RNA sequence: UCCGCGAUAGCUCAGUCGGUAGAGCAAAUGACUGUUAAUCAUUGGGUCCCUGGUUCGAGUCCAGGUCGCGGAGCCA
RNA sequence: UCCGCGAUAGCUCAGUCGGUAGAGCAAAUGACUGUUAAUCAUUGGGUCCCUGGUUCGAGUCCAGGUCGCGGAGCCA
């Protein structure tokens, strides 16, 4: 058996003002207090891209050693949901900020493997629904919050490797000072595109996208318990269907929230309000000089020049 | 050859010699006098040894803890300053003529009687020496007395003790069935019964007029505290009887049982409707020890400025109920905050209150932050209605019906016990007249109990407005806990079709889910009705035990495994192969 | 509201009106008079209709078979030409004042009439209408009365009705355990108990002096005609009692039971040793109704030319026994051949015989083809020994001990029933004094029950010569069938080690198979002994039923399963995955 | 496939019966067979130890045993465990596969030309006479019953 | 993921701003004539939850794991 | 694989050397005033175990299958 998985990580960038709005980012229990007119999608209002947002974006792009496009255009992800105010999510379809990079993940089985990252573009967050009376309550305090969607190349295999990649991403982002990294407050999130296949036959089991995964332990256990499930499913034959699954740490079972009846047509197209942002090589020339020393290479620098063990070097770095 | 039991040595047997066998509880060595506490099923007794027969002394010095011994001696009346209150036989002793060690004993892991700090896992792991403790033994013996009394009553009243099979057919909807892989039918399973319901109904069809059975039941659900996977139930079903007769026999049984065993008497059992119970207690299992009662008051608080009251007061899907707690105005704000947080856990947005101190001065006689938004007249007739006087506190629950009923119902029981506002006597009751249907989250109608429950009306008044239909179902409640319950079943063709039509189920599901049952029902089923009791909880109440595991011989933990026999365990691959099944614990990278 | 039962309508109730509810057995329509045979739990009664009230008549002509009706009428003393011998209430009638059809009934698959030869698969498929038949109902009601009497006795004698858990831990050696997959512990299984043996022993360790339980037992062995997978057993275990006391209480129980139910009396139960039982009956479960007895005669035939006798006669590993059947000299050679083939089925090379007609005429007085090879003196002292006179036949079995015992024992019981020699009365007995060991195919020694049975000798006389050792085990036999049995257990360390050494099993297996048990045994176990009865067979005997299915409410077929509820059935893949298993076929490596 | 195997046994039986070499009656114990069944997952030449089931009587027994062995090996490879070489047998009563002998090592039968018996030389003349003596094959005779003489497949087959 | 508490003799449980695992109970030996949850003296016993690291030295300090109770967070 | 027997209305069971599946019981309607396992008349009902073939036509005859009981054979 060979298990080919993927990872879609949403990282909350630590910027003062929102990506297109002027409201603050970090918020407390007070609802709708961090929402101006722009976030509420009032008719006639317009968005303006944040500076440090794209700065940190191409910063992560430079840190991950990815070919950054000279131009990147924001597209619209049109879908209807109460958390989404304007009826479309300002993302990036074609020409993302950063594309095709690689990250060296250090595991415990000897070699520190290299993993691929297909892209890492700029998105925007939406509101949150809560358990209350009857009807329901939507809070747009986190709506409009800048997001960085690091999508990894499906080169990542085993679950332990996946945990290693999430930890490496977390560490790199912590070093760059882009996101807090604290998964407890809800800054760093991720999804897993796991698909298993019997070695030898180009036919394989259906793809499983597990969304909303918190801790690393949750990641490992859910990915394993999904892999074995798919293994059973292909062994028995039955019906291999593509579904949107979820994981609860209480019962360690995988439940399907939505069954994917068809490919969701979000209707992507270049946003007429936002002009293509041009990142010239001078920006990258200055920012690369601003680039901090990578931790993965820092422990190795602690191995080479300074007399030290792997353990002490890693835990010191 | 035992003469008398240790724990049955009264003062009357003085001047008689006795031979008693048992275990050595604890041994006291004073040198010139040796004391032995011998224990059996009936209790402990003291045997004394003086070295005037130093041979018995030699057979007294070697004896240690839990040794199984047989002692013959004479019962001597102990001095006034030596009498023991703790020991039921503790006003007499026995001087040991001859002793014999029937069997030796290794040191018992844990000590008997408090404050020996055994912890529950260790007590369960060595359950075979734990039941040696006289308290546990008294509980189990009490259980035996209970089943004895119930069996005697039911036998004397023409019921037939008939056994129904455990290995039956699996089916969804009700609860998770424990499955048993079939050696003879590969790919097929047996299933442990949730209740002998279907079987008892078949037994009614079979012509047996009156049936009872003390049967084992099994549920594969995640469990609650006071909940076990294997639990014993007293099943009862009768033919050609209405609800009054059934409740009569069963009530009589409970009374006779309580008088046979604990020697208490119950007068008569009040019959309370579900609607009334929900109205003044907010619970389907009222605690009639607590006199505190919920009183509805939302009708006069409709057009009022205060909005958390007026909100649900004009909303039909809810109410605003008040709860008077007497003499409790002296209650500190700390406790108030604790209670608000308590009712918080059942979904109430807030616990409103009024401290009632001086009624003749009106509004300046009611200290509370809410009193300003509510008129003096309404206030006065409210205070009049709830029965409140000087010195009392009145709480307010104002929300959706379910929420206020549960939250105020629980606040009721909680503050009921916390202020010791109950009479300490036994208080039994019957809950009758349930509704027939309820909405199922998404919509539509569904039966709470079973679609086979008899409605009080006709299939026409039923197909008219199903919401106004009451069921002929009944639960028995003691000390606010549900001892058990059942109902009279439907045997009418047009009625079964009426409830079948009203629930949205076509004949496909009628056949797939209940076909064999309906089949058995079609070949001439008599008017029958029944009820079942959770025997475990009944014994738990009758003993005064804290948990249900205390009234079960060899119970299991909350995760369905028992630590003593280490079940469930692992089985060799052979037996696994012969039963036509496979595992799936495979090695991953 | 019923007034009286149909089958309890005596002649004394004349001039009184009665209301009785029940089923319509069969209906006779003469036009001018309508006859109804109404049946309830107690039996059948006759209801008569005259058209002087044509409304009840209208509600009588439409009424069909198995209709559930309620009839109120007056009990009339029937004419001399109409009295019914067959009907227990058949000396009275009831003139129907008013009738009401409580429920209609579709035509019953099989009839409930006596001696209508519908066949067993059909009888099993509609068991809910099959048990309506008064004979089956009488059997089940009898069972209830039996368990009632037994429970009453055991309760009155200070035994404790204690329940033991069903879901336990799996283990080999004894028998295949039915397994139950655990949802909470993946890869682990529960197991249905074969007997509450271990639990009852723990209950003895727990200090409970006397225990009894009517428990459900399950064996995953293949089936036969008189064997079922789910069977009820009467478990009994006591402390501080020897074998005499236990057999005393149990025997007393059986007598009291037989007098309570069937009203017969048993005098005293003869105690027969195993060796003796094998000597003159060739069976561990003798049928004391048949007076026929096996007599050994091998001693006078130790050096004779004929070899089927002489063969086993000089070999210690076998014997030559004779069997006298009285008045059976008129028997044709055909029957003899049938019998030879019969003993043939148990491995005997031949069934030799001698017809004794005139003992006083010598050699010309014993017609047989074998008589020539055997001397006159030996012959004469043989005839002297067996108790034979004019008119009897003496058969001869000469082979290995097992073979002659089984073949002549069975030929004995067979010709016992075939010639109608037994008087058809109840014949109880106790079988005592078993051997401790037997050899186990490959070699070595093994206990035919359990290694925990107490031997009569000491661990030294035991380690001396294991073959001469007798066990303290005991079986109760009625009409040649084994009602049940148990033994007194070992609680001695050195004795347990003696039997452990002598059985060849090291401490590894001792710990792995019985370790937790030995552990519980080490912490102070009292002298205890027990026994268990197969309740099903007991009721089968007490009813006089042919099969065990006749005394079980809802039995299963010979291939494990009941055709009525279609168990075992199939379960959906969800529940199969949640219990952490997948199915398959039968073969695996 | 197993059905192919049953077909092959039936073809052997038919051809040999036509040749008049063996009686063909499996009931009398004339014609016997063994099966060397071994499965392997497509793509990997790896896994799937050989299983030799001996003593197979009827065609039905052949089919059922081969199937129940194939699925067994499939399961064994799915679980992994221990794939060992053994010579198994099949009983139609329980439809289960039993192990007669555990193969500790490759049995050395020590093959060598028998010194008492000299090699028999079969010349092409022998074959020339026997080829003329050769009877018409049933498989081609039924097809010849289809071709030249007007007949259906069924009746031609059962006639042949 | 995060906060608090906890894993140490047969049982319960303590252990500072790092130096032979103590105490009650139980067990073993001995003493004592009225205890009754006896007492007193003496003796015996254990892998401080696992791994790695720190120090002259570890129950104690660092890092990473396992398990039990409860709380927080998440559940587009 | 082979031998014998068997599959046919709700139930039981018969059916020749090939011509609409009959009979007991049960069911439905009607008759009859003493039955009591009521009777009698009439009516309704069922894939002749599956498929293919033979014939003017199939329960019947041919070939190949399914299921129940027992026997035989094989088990280097």
Token pair for A113: 């493997």
Cβ-count burial B206-225 (b if 16+ within 10 Å, e if not) = bbbbbbbbbbbbbbbeebee
The minimal CB distance from C586 to the residues D81, D83, D95 is found for D95
Please tell me what DSSP assigns to residue B526. -
Taking the C-alpha atoms of residue C481 and residue B176, their distance in angstroms, rounded to an integer, is: 42
User: Which nucleotide comes closest to B108 if you measure CA to C1'?
Assistant: E10
B578 contacts C582? CB cut-off 8 A: no
Taking the C-alpha atoms of residue B183 and residue D94, their distance in angstroms, rounded to an integer, is: 11
- Provide the positions of strand E that have an atom within 7 A of a protein CB: 1-2, 10-13, 24-28, 31-39, 52-53, 62-63, 66, 72-76
Contact B179, B579 (CB under 8 A): no
Q: How far apart are the first and last CA of chain D?
A: 26
Distances (CA, A) of D57 to D7, D32, D65: 14, 6, 11
Contact A254, A229 (CB under 8 A): yes
Cβ-count burial C97-119 (b if 16+ within 10 Å, e if not) = eebebbbebeebebebeeeeeee
The minimal CB distance from C166 to the residues B128, B143, B216 is found for B216
Which pairing describes strands B43-49 and B93-103: parallel, antiparallel, or unpaired? parallel
Contact A59, A68 (CB under 8 A): no
Taking the C-alpha atoms of residue C528 and residue C455, their distance in angstroms, rounded to an integer, is: 14
* Angle of helix C197-205 versus helix C507-522 axis, rounded to 10: 40
Minimum CA–CA partner of C587 in chain D: D96
Supply the CATH classification number for the domain C1-106: 2.40.50.140
Residue ranges of the annotated binding site of C for ATP are 219-221, 228, 482, 534-537
Taking the C-alpha atoms of residue A173 and residue A180, their distance in angstroms, rounded to an integer, is: 8
Token pair for A286: 């200055």
The minimal CB distance from D78 to the residues A199, A201, A235 is found for A235
Contact C540, C134 (CB under 8 A): no
Which pairing describes strands A98-105 and C230-239: parallel, antiparallel, or unpaired? unpaired
Q: Tell whether the torsion through CA atoms of B136, B138, B140 and B143 is positive or negative.
A: negative
Taking the C-alpha atoms of residue C5 and residue B238, their distance in angstroms, rounded to an integer, is: 15
Protein CA at C518 to nucleotide C1' at E11, angstroms = 22
Q: Is the CB of A80 under 7 A from strand E?
A: no
Taking the C-alpha atoms of residue A100 and residue A117, their distance in angstroms, rounded to an integer, is: 6
Q: Is C68 on the interface with B (CB under 8 A)?
A: yes
Residue A240 DSSP SS3? coil
Protein CA at D26 to nucleotide C1' at F62, angstroms = 24
User: Which nucleotide comes closest to A81 if you measure CA to C1'?
Assistant: E76
Please tell me what DSSP assigns to residue A17. B
Taking the C-alpha atoms of residue D36 and residue C577, their distance in angstroms, rounded to an integer, is: 35
- Residue A223: count of CB within 10 angstroms of its CB: 25
Distances (CA, A) of A140 to A31, A137, A143, A163: 7, 10, 5, 31
Residue ranges of the annotated binding site of C are 173, 219-221, 228, 449, 482, 489, 534-537
- Interface partners of chain C (CB pairs < 8 Å, 3 or more) are A, B, D
Q: What are phi and psi of A123, to 5 degrees?
A: -120, -175
Token pair for C221: 């062995």
B587 contacts D79? CB cut-off 8 A: no
- Element housing A152 (H / E): strand A146-152
- Element housing B248 (H / E): helix B243-260
Q: Is the CB of C51 under 7 A from strand F?
A: yes
The Cα of A73 is separated from the nearest Cα of chain D by a number of Å equal to 44
D80 contacts B582? CB cut-off 8 A: no
Contact A98, A58 (CB under 8 A): yes
Contacts of C28 (CB under 8 A, 6+ apart): C34, C35, C36, C37
Taking the C-alpha atoms of residue B419 and residue B417, their distance in angstroms, rounded to an integer, is: 6
Token pair for C124: 């099993």
Distances (CA, A) of C272 to B355, C126, C249, D146: 87, 45, 18, 82
The Cα of B188 is separated from the nearest Cα of chain D by a number of Å equal to 17
Token pair for B216: 């084992």
HSE-CB at C71 with a 13 A cutoff on CA atoms is 32
Q: Is the CB of C158 under 7 A from strand F?
A: no
Q: Is A2 on the interface with D (CB under 8 A)?
A: no
Would you give the distance in Å from CA D105 to the centre of its chain? 25
Q: What is the DSSP string of B352-396?
A: EEEEE--GGGGGGGEE-SSGGGS-HHHHHHHHHHHT--TTEEEEE
Q: How many degrees, rounded to 5, is the angle at CA B20 between CA B17 and CA B26?
A: 115
Identify all chain D residues contacting A199, using CB atoms and an 8 Å cutoff.
Answer: 43-44
User: Which nucleotide comes closest to C87 if you measure CA to C1'?
Assistant: F36
Identify all chain D residues contacting A235, using CB atoms and an 8 Å cutoff.
Answer: 78
Q: Tell whether the torsion through CA atoms of A304, A309, A311 and A313 is positive or negative.
A: negative
Residue C4 DSSP SS3? coil
Q: What are phi and psi of C22, to 5 degrees?
A: 175, -165
Taking the C-alpha atoms of residue C547 and residue B520, their distance in angstroms, rounded to an integer, is: 25
Taking the C-alpha atoms of residue A109 and residue A117, their distance in angstroms, rounded to an integer, is: 22
Protein CA at C121 to nucleotide C1' at F5, angstroms = 20
Contact C253, C428 (CB under 8 A): no
Among the listed residues C329, C327, C355, C323, the one whose alpha carbon sits nearest the alpha carbon of residue C342: C323
Identify all chain B residues contacting A232, using CB atoms and an 8 Å cutoff.
Answer: 584
Based on its alpha-carbon atoms, the radius of gyration of chain D, rounded to whole angstroms, reads: 21
Partner A, chain D 4-63, Cβ-Cβ below 8 Å? 41-44
Identify all chain C residues contacting B164, using CB atoms and an 8 Å cutoff.
Answer: 553-554
- Element housing D17 (H / E): helix D2-19
Identify all chain C residues contacting B180, using CB atoms and an 8 Å cutoff.
Answer: 178-180, 192, 568
* Angle of helix C333-344 versus helix C401-418 axis, rounded to 10: 140
* Angle of helix A295-304 versus helix A159-176 axis, rounded to 10: 90
A200 contacts D44? CB cut-off 8 A: yes
Among the listed residues C27, C23, C38, C33, the one whose alpha carbon sits nearest the alpha carbon of residue C92: C38
Question: B180: burial class by Cβ within 10 Å (0-12, 13-18, 19+)?
Answer: buried
Q: Is the CB of B29 under 7 A from strand E?
A: yes
The answer to whether B537 is annotated as binding is: yes
Token pair for B227: 């909940």
- Element housing A122 (H / E): strand A113-124
The answer to whether B113 is annotated as binding is: no
- Interface partners of chain D (CB pairs < 8 Å, 3 or more) are A, B, C
Contact B443, B253 (CB under 8 A): no
Query: Which of D39, D40, D41, D43 should one mutate to test binding to chain A, selecting the residue with the greatest count of A CBs within 10 A?
Result: D43
- Provide the positions of strand F that have an atom within 7 A of a protein CB: 1-2, 10-13, 25-28, 31-39, 52-53, 62-63, 65-66, 72-76
Taking the C-alpha atoms of residue A288 and residue A295, their distance in angstroms, rounded to an integer, is: 16
Would you give the distance in Å from CA B86 to the centre of its chain? 30
* Angle of helix D2-19 versus helix D59-79 axis, rounded to 10: 150
User: Which nucleotide comes closest to C107 if you measure CA to C1'?
Assistant: F27
Protein CA at B211 to nucleotide C1' at E50, angstroms = 59
> Domain ranges in chain C?
1-106, 109-272+423-589, 273-422
Q: Tell whether the torsion through CA atoms of C118, C120, C125 and C131 is positive or negative.
A: positive
- Interface partners of chain B (CB pairs < 8 Å, 3 or more) are A, C, D
Contacts of B450 (CB under 8 A, 6+ apart): B487
Q: Is the CB of C47 under 7 A from strand F?
A: no
Q: Is the CB of B557 under 7 A from strand E?
A: no
Structure determined by: X-ray
A199 contacts D44? CB cut-off 8 A: yes
Please tell me what DSSP assigns to residue A210. E
Distances (CA, A) of D71 to A21, B182, B485, D37, D78: 63, 20, 51, 11, 10
Minimum CA–CA partner of A254 in chain C: C578
Distances (CA, A) of A292 to A149, A168, A296, B454: 21, 15, 12, 77
Order across the sheet with B351-356: list the strands. B294-296, B318-325, B392-400, B351-356, B366-367
Protein CA at A317 to nucleotide C1' at E54, angstroms = 18
Contact B353, B415 (CB under 8 A): no
Taking the C-alpha atoms of residue B88 and residue B95, their distance in angstroms, rounded to an integer, is: 18
Q: Is the CB of A83 under 7 A from strand E?
A: yes
Q: What is the DSSP string of B196-230?
A: SHHHHHHHHHTT-SEEEEEEEEE--S---TT--SE
Taking the C-alpha atoms of residue B168 and residue C569, their distance in angstroms, rounded to an integer, is: 9
A33: domain range?
A: 1-292
Token pair for C230: 């789910």
Q: What are phi and psi of B438, to 5 degrees?
A: -150, 165
Question: C68: burial class by Cβ within 10 Å (0-12, 13-18, 19+)?
Answer: buried
Tell me the CATH number of domain B273-422, given options 3.40.47.10, 3.40.50.300, 3.40.50.2300, 3.30.1360.30. 3.30.1360.30
> If you count residue pairs, one on A and one on C, with CB atoms under 8 Å apart, how many are there?
3
The Cα of D42 is separated from the nearest Cα of chain A by a number of Å equal to 7
- Please give the sequence-ordered ranges of beta strands (E in DSSP) within chain D, or none if there are none: 35-37, 51-54, 86-91, 96-102
Within C 67-96, residues with CB less than 7 Å from strand F: 78-79, 81-84, 86-87, 90, 93
Identify all chain D residues contacting A200, using CB atoms and an 8 Å cutoff.
Answer: 41-44
Q: Give the torsion through C-alpha atoms of A162, A164, A166, A168, to 10 deg.
A: -150
Q: What is the DSSP string of C162-205?
A: ----SSB---SSS-PPPEEE-SSSTT-EEE--S-SHHHHHHHHH
Would you give the distance in Å from CA A109 to the centre of its chain? 26
Taking the C-alpha atoms of residue B489 and residue B204, their distance in angstroms, rounded to an integer, is: 11
Contact B178, C180 (CB under 8 A): yes
Residue B232 DSSP SS3? strand
Q: What are phi and psi of C34, to 5 degrees?
A: -110, 130
Distances (CA, A) of B289 to B90, B419, B422, C38: 36, 13, 5, 50
Taking the C-alpha atoms of residue B175 and residue C575, their distance in angstroms, rounded to an integer, is: 11
The fourth-level CATH superfamily of domain C109-272+423-589 is: Bira Bifunctional Protein; Domain 2 (3.30.930.10)
Taking the C-alpha atoms of residue C209 and residue C236, their distance in angstroms, rounded to an integer, is: 11
Minimum CA–CA partner of D94 in chain B: B184
Q: Which residue has the tokens 């007949």?
A: D151
C589 contacts D68? CB cut-off 8 A: no
Contact B587, B577 (CB under 8 A): no
Token pair for A163: 């945990």
Which pairing describes strands B351-356 and B470-478: parallel, antiparallel, or unpaired? unpaired
Contact D33, D9 (CB under 8 A): yes
Among the listed residues B43, B65, B551, the one whose alpha carbon sits nearest the alpha carbon of residue C207: B43
Distances (CA, A) of C150 to B291, C37, C251, C258, C536: 46, 35, 12, 10, 14
Among the listed residues C382, C397, C413, the one whose alpha carbon sits nearest the alpha carbon of residue C481: C413
Among the listed residues B361, B377, B283, the one whose alpha carbon sits nearest the alpha carbon of residue B323: B283
Taking the C-alpha atoms of residue C394 and residue C380, their distance in angstroms, rounded to an integer, is: 13
């Amino acid at each position: 058996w060979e298990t080919v998985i993927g990872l879609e990580i949403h990282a909350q960038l630590a910027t003062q003002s929102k990506i297109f709005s002027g409201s603050s980012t970090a918020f407390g229990a007070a609802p709708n207090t961090q929402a101006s007119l722009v976030d509420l999608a009032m008719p006639g209002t317009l968005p303006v891209l944040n500076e440090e947002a794209v700065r940190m974006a191409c910063l992560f792009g430079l840190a991950i050693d990815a070919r950054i496009d000279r131009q990147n255009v924001f597209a619209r992800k049109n879908y209807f949901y109460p958390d989404l105010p304007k009826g479309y999510q300002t993302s990036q379809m074609d020409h993302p900020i950063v594309g095709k990079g690689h990250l060296d993940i250090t595991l415990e089985d000897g070699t520190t493997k290299r993993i691929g990252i297909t892209r890492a573009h700029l998105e925007e967050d939406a509101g949150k629904s809560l358990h209350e009376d009857g009807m329901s309550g939507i809070d747009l305090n986190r709506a409009g919050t800048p997001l960085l969607e690091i999508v990894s190349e499906p080169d990542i295999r085993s679950a332990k490797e996946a945990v290693a990649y999430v930890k490496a991403i977390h560490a790199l982002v912590r070093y760059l000072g882009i996101c807090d990294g604290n998964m407890a407050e809800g800054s760093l999130r991720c999804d897993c595109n796991v698909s298993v296949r019997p070695k030898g036959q180009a036919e394989f089991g259906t793809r499983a996208e597990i969304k909303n995964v918190n801790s690393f332990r949750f990641i490992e256990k859910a990915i394993n318990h999904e892999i074995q499930r798919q293994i059973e499913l292909i062994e028995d034959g039955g019906k291999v269907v593509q579904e949107t699954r979820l994981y609860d740490p209480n019962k360690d079972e995988t439940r399907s929230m939505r069954g994917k009846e068809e490919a969701n047509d979000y209707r992507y197209f270049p946003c007429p309000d936002l002009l293509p942002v041009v990142i010239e090589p001078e920006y990258l020339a200055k920012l690369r000089e601003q680039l901090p020393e990578l931790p993965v290479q820092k422990r190795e620098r602690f191995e080479s020049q300074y007399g030290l063990s792997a353990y002490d070097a890693s835990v010191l770095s | 050859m035992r003469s008398h039991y240790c724990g049955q040595l009264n003062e009357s047997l003085d001047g008689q010699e006795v031979t008693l066998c048992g275990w050595v509880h604890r041994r006291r060595d004073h040198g010139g006098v040796i004391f032995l506490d011998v224990r059996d099923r009936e209790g402990l007794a003291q045997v004394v040894f003086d070295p005037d027969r130093a041979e018995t002394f030699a057979k007294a010095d070697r004896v240690r803890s839990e040794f199984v011994v047989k002692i013959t001696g004479k019962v001597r009346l102990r001095p006034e300053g030596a009498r023991n209150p703790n020991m039921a036989s503790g006003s007499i002793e026995v001087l040991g003529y001859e002793l014999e060690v029937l069997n030796q004993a290794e040191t018992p892991p844990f000590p008997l009687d408090e404050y020996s700090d055994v912890g529950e896992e260790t007590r369960l792991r060595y359950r075979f020496i734990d039941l040696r403790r006289p308290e546990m033994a008294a509980k189990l013996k009490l259980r035996a007395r209970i089943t004895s009394s119930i069996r005697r009553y039911l036998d004397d009243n023409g019921f037939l003790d008939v056994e129904t099979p455990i290995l039956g057919r699996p089916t969804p909807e009700g609860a998770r069935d424990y499955l048993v892989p079939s050696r003879t039918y590969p790919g097929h399973f047996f299933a442990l019964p949730q209740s002998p319901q279907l079987f008892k109904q078949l037994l009614m069809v079979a012509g047996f007029d009156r049936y009872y059975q003390i049967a084992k039941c099994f549920r594969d659900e995640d469990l609650r505290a006071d909940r076990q996977p294997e639990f014993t139930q007293i099943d009862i079903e009768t033919s050609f009887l209405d609800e009054s007769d059934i409740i009569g026999i069963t009530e009589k049984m409970v009374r006779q049982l309580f008088k046979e065993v604990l020697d208490v008497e119950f007068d008569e059992f009040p019959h309370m409707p579900f609607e009334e119970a929900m109205r003044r207690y907010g619970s389907d299992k009222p605690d009639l020890r607590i006199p505190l009662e919920l009183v509805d008051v939302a009708d006069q608080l409709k057009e009022v400025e205060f909005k958390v009251f007026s909100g649900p007061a004009n909303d039909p899907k809810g109410r605003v109920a008040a709860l008077r707690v007497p003499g409790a105005a002296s209650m500190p704000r700390s406790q108030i905050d604790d209670y608000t947080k308590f009712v918080g856990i059942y979904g109430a947005k807030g616990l409103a209150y009024i401290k009632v101190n001086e009624r003749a001065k009106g509004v300046e006689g009611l200290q509370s932050p809410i009193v300003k938004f509510i008129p003096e007249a309404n206030l006065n007739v409210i205070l009049d209605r709830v029965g409140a006087v000087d010195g009392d506190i009145v709480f307010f629950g104002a929300d959706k019906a379910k929420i206020v009923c549960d939250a105020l119902g629980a606040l009721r029981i909680k503050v009921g016990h916390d202020l010791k506002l109950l009479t300490r006597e036994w208080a039994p009751m019957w809950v009758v007249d349930f509704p027939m249907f309820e909405e199922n989250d998404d919509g539509s109608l569904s039966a709470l109990h079973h679609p086979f429950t008899s409605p009080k009306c006709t299939p026409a008044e039923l197909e008219a407005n199903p919401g106004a239909a009451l069921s002929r179902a009944y639960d028995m409640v003691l000390n606010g806990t549900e001892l058990g319950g059942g109902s009279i079943r439907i045997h009418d063709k047009s009625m079964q079709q009426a409830v079948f039509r009203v629930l949205g189920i076509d004949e496909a599901e009628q056949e797939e889910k209940f076909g064999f049952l309906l089949d058995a029902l079609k070949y001439g089923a008599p008017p029958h009705g029944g009820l079942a009791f959770g025997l475990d909880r009944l014994v738990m109440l009758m003993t005064g035990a804290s948990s249900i595991r205390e009234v079960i011989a060899f119970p299991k933990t909350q995760s369905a495994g028992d630590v003593m026999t280490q079940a469930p365990g692992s089985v060799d691959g052979k037996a696994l192969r012969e039963l036509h099944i496979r595992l799936r614990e495979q090695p991953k990278a």
